[PDB]
Design a protein around this ligand. Structure first.
Ligand SMILES: Cc1cn([C@H]2C[C@H](O)[C@@H](CO)O2)c(=O)[nH]c1=O
Ligand SMILES: Cc1cn([C@H]2C[C@H](O)[C@@H](CO)O2)c(=O)[nH]c1=O
Lengths: 813, 813
């Protein structure tokens, strides 16, 4: 149908149809008389999968022959979403499959909806890893994603009585056609035990063994015939495990629990033993795999060349045990001297920090490491001693610096600071947006920056334009391709060419048409799937992201109520109609975040049924926000809410997705918002609120929320409404926790940005009244979004950290 | 190579080779440079599997169109062994695959050894179910095997220091290419809860739900294009299960433990809750499936026709809950009156008894059923009351009969007798050999036989001649086919034609040649796989079966020691050389059986290293006896030990396997031995020992083992050797338990058959000295083994119990 979706050749369509029928019969053991839509999905998935394997086998063969430097991206999260459409897009198969299925009497879009999300992540950190895999393959890098194959990913969110309920995400129930089990490459992982000292050094003995079984998933590059591997480990008990008889077999579950479930915490550290086991499990299995592959190479025994052939990227501190595990292997098993092993380790490892929030920092109790990983604790102590000797020599007599920089934190319970471990043992440390990387050097890692300035870098985050434009917004990709061609899909900077169309009346009309079509499609989706009714002519005001105090969904709530109260006061006055959509999951143990969700639904319950309001204001909570829902709602958005307190959102990536898809942004000067506004021009962004410096000034003086309550009558009214039970008539004190927090212990200064936020929102409404000028501003946003491609981000990692050159050259098909 | 293995056509060989290469590439994601023998096995398995599915789909389609009476064979055990060779044989693909693989440069026999046994059974009962599935498909019956997909089957047995060690049988590790998961047909199963009474009758409420997910495996008939289904249920937790968060997800294991492991007890009842859950789980899921299929039929709401369209065969009492579950569904859910529901139930269900040993009888504590299955207990009580009212009316005033026949057993703990439940609720009750069925009517079920004589039948067990001749002994199948053609493979009675060759010098030579070849092949297998050395010219004396006191492996041990002692006494006297092979698993909790294994190895330790003995006597314990090992050792055997105490082995099936494969039998008149001797002629069998009547006489008088010890000096010497530590010098009292049992509490009268056994063994040795007359007796055995085909057995079930007619007619290919 559309150009960007590739060719539908007579030869290709015929071949796809017959392979579809082959899989339905031989693979699924079905005929057309018993087959369900799910069977049809699987037959298509297997058909597309077949096209991958040839390229997969020759890509990996190519790496064996050429022996390039390999990049190992270690992450506890890979938030992949659905794979079918992504694979079709990257292989140029979308139109052909569309034609083949049409001729078989099936709707491909209907089949696509059957696939489960691979929800092996929480939010931004996990989705960044997924975008990175796509870009690394597209840029022809010899890259491997390594993680855990969780049996249960992020929970499915149900809303019951306005409250979040969690249910298990049994994503593997019907099987996963994309993975290939590799039980032949199973590796042992050790836990507990004790350290024995001999003449030949230390020995780790009396350990419990858990097996790590790898599952490989193909990662196709964009139309370059490169297919990389994501390898995920699954925990398996050994066959002599605990070997009355029946109980010993049933107790195998204890070992296998390691890969059972993703911890559903976003930006929050929970110090549980099972989580530590997960972290070591991925690290130990991966490093064995890396070393095996290094020894079995067409190059060289000699670990001097190890950093020339291997890069390990630590995604946050979660895989930080890679550092002492590499030391363990090099010193204890390979018998390298400490100094040499350390040189190799430092030159191999690099660390990406994702947040400055103290509650998110991993600080593991020494007693846990002592029991679980006794040799690693000894190695960490030795790393610390040698590191602090360096600090002492550089800053003689500075005794407080020594305590501040120690990897060992003293107190009631001794803890290991994993972030400090990562900096000491890595040659590169990067933040994820310019303002964030600056904050790291100025505040939390100031001491480390003073010691080793060369180590500290910035790599501004990005998103893949394949999933986040071509896949989810084909209508916009097409109208862009009509004007400037198809090259921008792997060279997003080319979108700048669109600035010469900002005064083009045809383009203006097409951009606005694509948005309305997206809005209609999403309005219909909401009716069919959730029986909720919205006005497609209203401004689509959306905030989608994990529920957090720092992300200030509560500030959004205050504005919504302000709008409602203003309507009730002057009912017959004209207001720009809005649909306010808020979605996202709260961590199961996060009480305040669960209360915020309840508040949002409670506001909807009042606002959506007030006859005086009409269709002028609607508040909808978007249930079960996840990658597949993001791909639907983002193309439909007019306004993107990026309203975190300045200095708290390290980067954000949702912000970039909205920019690429034709929404305007209301936001604080936080994370990547700053660089986005810089790229588009501040006139083309709705910036408001305190800057980082203003927050600091308020902290020094002391934040008093009462001041704002006293001086802003509209704010006072809302608080009174909340307190008195206006939004909860049956349970008048339901929101007392929220009010108390806002008034007395608000770390994120909701009230301080309220006035500027509301005024800025008025300016948004004013512009939306002028469709032509709204769209012209949109065009200026899309046209300058090129910097935020993860291809740019990965190219910078490649050149400035990993020491490898990216390549757009095709492999032979 | 050989005729019986089918045609190797140029067209077929070419097609197999290319499909092999397709699977290696697309299915396994490998090329010839990285592929291991295991990869090659899987590519072949997938290639052969493809040939099944077409026939599988049209067989099931055929049953839907014709709507025949369906046979449901319910069993907690299906001891299937390997599937690759069986599938090739039944599809006439063996020579073609042999040629195709040869041309690809691979040895097919080597690939066959890679397949794991499907070891979902303990011994005879589980293997009978497997043979039955084969025969039902071969006879064109619309039959379904229903069971549990155990994650772990029967344990792998390792021998360490002469002791049995158990390890988990992780048979699914590398995947199972033969099964097809059917998550779309998942069914709920209920546990616990309570019974509520309404105006509309009883309601079972507040239950815990466990999901039953089916996996389907094809069962091909012998060259008739019929492919039936074995459906095995797997336990799955529902997604809202227990839904802090992490623990609730981890607790899903509790529900899924139901299908985790096979109870490794042979002929022994262990009253554990998990076992009861397994028994109900299979029954509840199966009956829902049966009823669904009955309602969705081209026939008829009206349950009058239910017994005309459905037969349920209960394999032992393990699925006995089918009876009250069918009543539950008919009365509580379908709202049929009791009397009508009961008529339907009785006409639908039939029960096969497998043993008379009291320790094997299922007697479930009422308190377990009360908690787990409260509605079923109520139904059982009602069944009992109505049944006892019938007994009371037939035998007025016979109060002891009432207590003897009750389904409820009174005592310290109240129990339900599941065997009594089965008889009451079935229209047919059968034993598994003529002597066994007679014992049932005369002893343990005498009261029931008096009430309902018409209910009681015999169905002598059998074995499939496909697996147990063609597959495991191609050499013998071929020399037979040369003389009488190929028809005997599905009409085993034709082997009688071989009696006209008993004086044929060519045939005599060929039979003896096939045996020597089998012996050489097995002698080589033992060296390659277990580094043990045997003389292939010796008499292969084998006892392979589960280790049990009733099977009297100890009587064999006494003979072995007698032979050793006789050699030591007259070293320079000639004796017929023997290799005595004993193999089989002991239940993990069965102490005496574990001691017997230790004894056997301890005898070997002395006998095998005595220089005076030479190669005249060897005692070898065959480790990890299982279906695949049976297929190797049985064709190699000269002498089959079937020496259970008369009246204890209900039938035996191992006995039949040895008869079909050219071994002579030494045995008691027990189980099917009686019918075997009757078929071949007593002159052609080595029968010894007490008959049932002699055992009874000894019981009435009182068995005194001391009498035998006092009067038999050779027996006395052995006991002294055991007691003094001759077979355990470092631990002199090691075998005190065995001696004590033998002397004071021997339920199975080992000593009473010792004299006759030893004398009979002398007659065996005498005949073996005359190769020509040994072989002529062998020919008389093979020629009369036709009755013991499971095709005969299943034809009798079909006609006399299920009311269906068998068919040898081909389905179209
Ligand atoms: C589970 C969870 C709890 N919390 C709770 C624990 C702390 O008491 C509080 C932060 O001060 O919020 C989070 O902030 N984030 C989370 O993800
Ligand atoms: C596990 C097991 C134990 N036993 C034990 C339990 C009883 O105490 C004894 C039989 O009297 O043997 C068996 O006989 N068979 C078995 O399978």
């Amino acid at each position: 149908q559309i150009s960007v979706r590739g060719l539908a050749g007579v030869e290709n369509v015929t071949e796809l149809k017959k392979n579809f029928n082959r899989h339905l019969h031989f693979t699924l053991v079905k005929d057309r008389n018993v087959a369900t839509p799910r069977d049809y999905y699987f037959a298509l998935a297997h058909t597309v999968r077949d096209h991958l394997v040839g390229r997969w086998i020759r890509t990996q063969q190519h790496y064996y022959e050429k022996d390039p430097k390999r990049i190992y991206y270690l992450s506890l999260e890979f938030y992949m979403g659905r794979t079918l459409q992504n694979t079709m897009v990257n292989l140029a198969l979308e139109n052909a499959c569309d034609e083949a299925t049409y001729q078989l009497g099936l709707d491909m879009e209907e089949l696509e909806e059957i696939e489960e999300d691979a929800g092996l992540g929480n939010g931004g950190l996990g989705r960044l890893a997924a975008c990175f895999l796509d870009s690394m393959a597209t840029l022809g890098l010899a890259a491997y994603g390594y993680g855990i194959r969780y049996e249960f990913g992020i929970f499915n969110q149900k809303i019951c009585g306005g409250w979040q309920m969690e249910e298990a995400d049994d994503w593997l129930r019907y099987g996963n056609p994309w993975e290939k089990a590799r039980p032949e490459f199973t590796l042992p992982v050790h836990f507990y035990g004790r350290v024995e000292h001999t003449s030949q050094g230390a020995k780790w003995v009396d350990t419990q063994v858990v097996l790590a079984m790898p599952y490989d998933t193909p990662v196709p590059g964009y139309r370059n015939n490169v297919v990389n591997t994501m390898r995920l480990w699954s925990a398996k008990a050994p066959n002599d495990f605990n070997l009355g008889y029946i109980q010993a077999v049933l107790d195998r579950n204890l070992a296998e629990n390691i890969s059972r479930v993703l911890y559903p915490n976003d930006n929050f550290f929970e110090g549980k033993e099972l989580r530590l086991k997960q972290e070591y499990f991925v690290v130990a299995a991966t490093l064995q795999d890396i070393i095996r592959r290094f020894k079995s190479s067409k190059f060289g025994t000699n670990f001097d060349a190890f950093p020339d052939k291997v890069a390990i990227q630590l995604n946050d501190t979660h895989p930080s045990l890679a550092i002492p595990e590499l030391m363990r292997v090099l010193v204890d098993l390979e018998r390298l001297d400490w100094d040499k092993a350390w040189e190799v380790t430092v030159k191999t490892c690099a660390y990406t920090n994702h947040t400055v929030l103290p509650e998110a920092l991993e600080r593991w109790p020494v007693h846990l490491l002592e029991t679980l990983l006794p040799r690693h604790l000894q190695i960490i102590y030795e790393i610390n001693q040698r590191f602090l000797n360096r600090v002492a020599a550089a800053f003689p007599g500075d005794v407080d610096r020594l305590r501040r920089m120690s990897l060992v934190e003293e107190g009631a319970v001794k803890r290991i600071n994993m972030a400090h471990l990562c900096i000491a043992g890595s040659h590169a440390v990067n933040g994820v947006a310019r303002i964030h990387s600056e904050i790291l050097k100025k505040t939390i890692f100031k001491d480390f920056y003073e010691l080793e300035p060369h180590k500290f870098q910035n790599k501004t985050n990005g998103i893949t334009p394949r999933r986040w434009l071509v896949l989810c917004n084909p209508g916009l990709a097409e109208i862009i391709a009509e004007r400037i061609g198809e090259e921008y899909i792997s060279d997003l900077d080319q979108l700048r060419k669109l600035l010469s169309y900002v005064d083009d009346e045809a383009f203006i009309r097409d951009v606005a048409k694509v948005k309305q079509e997206n809005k209609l499609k999403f309005a219909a989706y909401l009716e069919r799937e959730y029986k909720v009714h919205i006005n497609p002519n209203s401004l689509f005001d959306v905030q989608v992201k994990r529920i957090h105090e720092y992300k200030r969904q509560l500030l959004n709530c205050l504005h919504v109520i302000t709008l409602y109260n203003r309507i009730k006061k002057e009912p017959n006055k004209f207001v720009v109609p809005r649909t306010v959509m808020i979605g996202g999951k709260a961590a199961p143990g996060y009480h305040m975040a669960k209360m915020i969700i309840k508040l949002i639904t409670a506001i909807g319950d009042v606002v959506n049924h007030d006859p005086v309001v009409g269709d002028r204001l609607r508040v909808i909570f978007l249930e079960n926000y996840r990658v597949s829902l993001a791909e639907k709602v983002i193309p439909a958005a007019d306004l993107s809410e990026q309203i975190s307190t300045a200095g708290t959102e390290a980067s954000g990536t949702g912000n970039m997705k909205f920019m690429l898809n034709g929404a305007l942004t209301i936001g604080t000067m936080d994370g990547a918002n700053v660089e986005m506004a810089e790229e588009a021009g501040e006139e083309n962004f709705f910036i408001f609120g305190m800057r980082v410096e203003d927050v600091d000034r308020l902290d020094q003086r002391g934040y008093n929320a009462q001041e704002y309550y006293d001086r802003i009558p509209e704010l006072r009214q809302i608080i009174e409404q909340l307190s008195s039970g206006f939004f909860s008539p049956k349970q008048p004190d339901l929101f007392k926790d929220i009010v108390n927090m806002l008034m007395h212990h608000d770390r994120f200064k909701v009230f301080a940005d309220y006035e500027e936020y509301v005024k800025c929102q008025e300016r948004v409404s004013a512009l939306y009244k002028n469709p032509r000028e709204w769209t012209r501003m949109v065009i200026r946003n899309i046209a300058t979004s090129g910097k935020f491609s993860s291809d740019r981000t990965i190219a910078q990692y490649a050149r400035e950290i990993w020491g490898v050159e990216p390549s757009r050259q095709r492999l032979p098909a």
